[PDB]
Amino acid sequence: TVGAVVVDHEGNVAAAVSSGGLALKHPGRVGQAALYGCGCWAENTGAHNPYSTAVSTSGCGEHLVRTILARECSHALQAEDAHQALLETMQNKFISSPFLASEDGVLGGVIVLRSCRQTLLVEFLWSHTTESMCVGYMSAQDGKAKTHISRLPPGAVAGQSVAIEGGVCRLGSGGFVLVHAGAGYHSESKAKEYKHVCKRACQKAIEKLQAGALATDAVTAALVELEDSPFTNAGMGSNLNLLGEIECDASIMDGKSLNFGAVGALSGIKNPVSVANRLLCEGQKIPPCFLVGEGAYRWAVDHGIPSCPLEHHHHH
Amino acid sequence: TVGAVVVDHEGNVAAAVSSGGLALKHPGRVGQAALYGCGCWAENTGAHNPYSTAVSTSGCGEHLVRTILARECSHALQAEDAHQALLETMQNKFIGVLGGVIVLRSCRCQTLLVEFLWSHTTESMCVGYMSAQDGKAKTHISRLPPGAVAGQSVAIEGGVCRLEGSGSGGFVLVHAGAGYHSESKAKEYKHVCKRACQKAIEKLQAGALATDAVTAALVELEDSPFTNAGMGSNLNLLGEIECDASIMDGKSLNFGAVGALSGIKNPVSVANRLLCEGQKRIPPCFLVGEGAYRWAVDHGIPSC
Numbered sequence: 101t102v103g104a105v106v107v108d109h110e111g112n113v114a115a116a117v118s119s120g121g122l123a124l125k126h127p128g129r130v131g132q133a134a135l136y137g138c139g140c141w142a143e144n145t146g147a148h149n150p151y152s153t154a155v156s157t158s159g160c161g162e163h164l165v166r167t168i169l170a171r172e173c174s175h176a177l178q179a180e181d182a183h184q185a186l187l188e189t190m191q192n193k194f195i196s197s198p199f200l201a202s203e204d205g206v207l208g209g210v211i212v213l214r215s216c217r218q219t220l221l222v223e224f225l226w227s228h229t230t231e232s233m234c235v236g237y238m239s240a241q242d243g244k245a246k247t248h249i250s251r252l253p254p255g256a257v258a259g260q261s262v263a264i265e266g267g268v269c270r271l272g273s274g275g276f277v278l279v280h281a282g283a284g285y286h287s288e289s290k291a292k293e294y295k296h297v298c299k300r301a302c303q304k305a306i307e308k309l310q311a312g313a314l315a316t317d318a319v320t321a322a323l324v325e326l327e328d329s330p331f332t333n334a335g336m337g338s339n340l341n342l343l344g345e346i347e348c349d350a351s352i353m354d355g356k357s358l359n360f361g362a363v364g365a366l367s368g369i370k371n372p373v374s375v376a377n378r379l380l381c382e383g384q385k386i387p388p389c390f391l392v393g394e395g396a397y398r399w400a401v402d403h404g405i406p407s408c409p410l411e412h413h414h415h416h
Numbered sequence: 417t418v419g420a421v422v423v424d425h426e427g428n429v430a431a432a433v434s435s436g437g438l439a440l441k442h443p444g445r446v447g448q449a450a451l452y453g454c455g456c457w458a459e460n461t462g463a464h465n466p467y468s469t470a471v472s473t474s475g476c477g478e479h480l481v482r483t484i485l486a487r488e489c490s491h492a493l494q495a496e497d498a499h500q501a502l503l504e505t506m507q508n509k510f511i512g513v514l515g516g517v518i519v520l521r522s523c524r525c526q527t528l529l530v531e532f533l534w535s536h537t538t539e540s541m542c543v544g545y546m547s548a549q550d551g552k553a554k555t556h557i558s559r560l561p562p563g564a565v566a567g568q569s570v571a572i573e574g575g576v577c578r579l580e581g582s583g584s585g586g587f588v589l590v591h592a593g594a595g596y597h598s599e600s601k602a603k604e605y606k607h608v609c610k611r612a613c614q615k616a617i618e619k620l621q622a623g624a625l626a627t628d629a630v631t632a633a634l635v636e637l638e639d640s641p642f643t644n645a646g647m648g649s650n651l652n653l654l655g656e657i658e659c660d661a662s663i664m665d666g667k668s669l670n671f672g673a674v675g676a677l678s679g680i681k682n683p684v685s686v687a688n689r690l691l692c693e694g695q696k697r698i699p700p701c702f703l704v705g706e707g708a709y710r711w712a713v714d715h716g717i718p719s720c
């Protein structure tokens with residue numbers, strides 16, 4: 101699973117998530133990366149909301165769904181202390197959720213940012229209960245993406261302990277991006293590989309922002325790079341399902357409009373996040389926000405999103 | 417859309433929802449009746465939840481901004497005044513957007529105090545309800561007041577039911593749709609709600625789980641050609657039926673759901689079967705499309 105969160109120079113936030121789901125899953129199984137409130141969340145400051153907040157999740161899909169973690173994190177981040185709010189959410193609303201009390205271990209990760217105001221104060225954090233999680237972050241002013249394999253400390257137990265880190269950033273046409281390329285066990289073997297795709301994904305988002313793009317288009321450009329890595333379980337290289345076929349989940353949310361787009365069980369499209377973003381975009385102009393399976397493919401093709409008919413399945 | 421909520425004689429709750437979705441929708445469009453937290457919710461009392469609560473919602477395709485409706489109603493119903501809490505929630509969310517909800521919350525006092533409500537901003541909503549003690553299902557057509565504008569006002573009514581003895585009883589509240597008022601189809605909506613409640617109670621009285629009872633209710637509601645669910649669902653853009661359904665169990669908190677399901681007579685039966693198998697890698701809780709069809713047939717669920 102891959103994800104990204106973006107804030108532009110005005111405090112407009114966006115979030116997206118893309119995944120290939122569980123290996124050998126039954127055909128048509130849709131997971132967290134497609135589900136409203138679960139895979140990602142983005143919400144600009146407003147009446148109640150003193151902060152703009154963006155969240156993207158990773159790890160065990162079912163664990164993330166049952167606790168609606170992305171939205172839960174965004175609501176907790178309206179509290180004054182962001183570090184403490186996220187840590188308590190991960191401990192109490194995730195690991196200790198009654199919705200997961202049957203589970204022997206709760207496995208998940210999250211990336212967040214929140215901003216508030218002509219200076220923009222961005223706080224960004226990542227937290228995970230998996231052994232590790234690869235992140236990358238970049239601001240348009242620092243102009244050099246930083247990547248980091250966050251690991252659980254010695255003595256921690258994967259699925260029972262929480263790791264959490266983060267930082268702060270004061271920001272024209274700039275902005276800030278944080279991405280992740282998977283939360284689970286890691287191998288030092290392809291650790292530089294995850295770090296490299298995270299760096300490139302940050303650079304693409306930053307370049308989009310520096311060209312005047314909307315937050316949603318910049319977060320989508322980040323996820324396109326993350327998907328395209330043959331090493332990530334999203335887009336190309338997604339785990340194969342029980343029938344040895346590709347079925348992708350992806351979604352995106354805009355903090356300003358609160359509009360949402362999502363695809364589930366999608367095969368034959370190179371970049372699932374692009375269909376999610378096109379659904380969100382076309383929906384701003386009763387438009388659909390969530391398409392699955394055969395109809396999602398046909399809708400993507402009809403809108404000129406690059407396809408792979410040889411990778412598309414349509415069983416009877 | 418059709419939905420039902422149930423509480424068994426022990427205070428266990430369940431909820432389910434089933435819909436054909438939006439007429440002429442693009443193929444593969446999945447709506448709220450399939451989405452966790454959105455179409456239905458069921459949660460027994462717990463360390464923060466003083467009431468066992470169950471919620472089923474009905475929408476007219478216009479899904480709401482920053483809204484996970486069934487779960488949000490369940491959380492709001494932890495306040496002391498349930499009527500005010502549902503009213504505030506409907507107002508702060510819908511008021512315009514068209515939709516409706518049925519809810520119940522129970523608590524142990526051994527006796528069970530069950531409060532049940534329905535609320536809509538559509539012109540009308542048909543509901544039915546029944547306790548195992550009384551033995552006669554009651555059906556009713558809820559209307560906006562004279563002079564109200566759909567999407568600019570909220571109707572809300574409900575009742576209170578006391579169950580006791582802890583035999584094999586319970587309570588069920590169903591709805592057959594929130595939408596435009598049809599004087600002509602009113603009798604048919606009331607009759608299917610009647611049959612749905614009776615099936616739900618028959619299950620409870622046989623000792624069944626609350627999820628089996630709420631499934632039996634929705635099977636009846638689905639089968640009516642008048643409901644936009646199962647048989648008679650709105651046809652999509654290509655002239656085909658694609659169904660969404662889900663179900664939640666308040667005791668285990670488990671969940672099952674299908675979206676864009678074609679070719680299966682009773683979608684809620686697949687959602688319930690996904691939940692039941694989950695009770696035993698975590699099994700899938702949400703299947704869509706052809707994979708959902710194949711899974712249903714592979715599990716002996718009748719196709720049409």
Ligand SMILES: [Cl-]
Binds near residue numbers: 124125129700
């Ligand atoms: Cl599976």
Ligand SMILES: [Cl-]
Binds near residue numbers: 101334
């Ligand atoms: Cl990955």
Ligand SMILES: [Cl-]
Binds near residue numbers: 386387388441442445
């Ligand atoms: Cl549509």
Ligand SMILES: [Cl-]
Binds near residue numbers: 417418592594644
């Ligand atoms: Cl209906």
Ligand code: NA
Binds near residue numbers: 327331337
């Ligand atoms: Na990939």
Ligand code: NA
Binds near residue numbers: 640643645649
């Ligand atoms: Na029907």
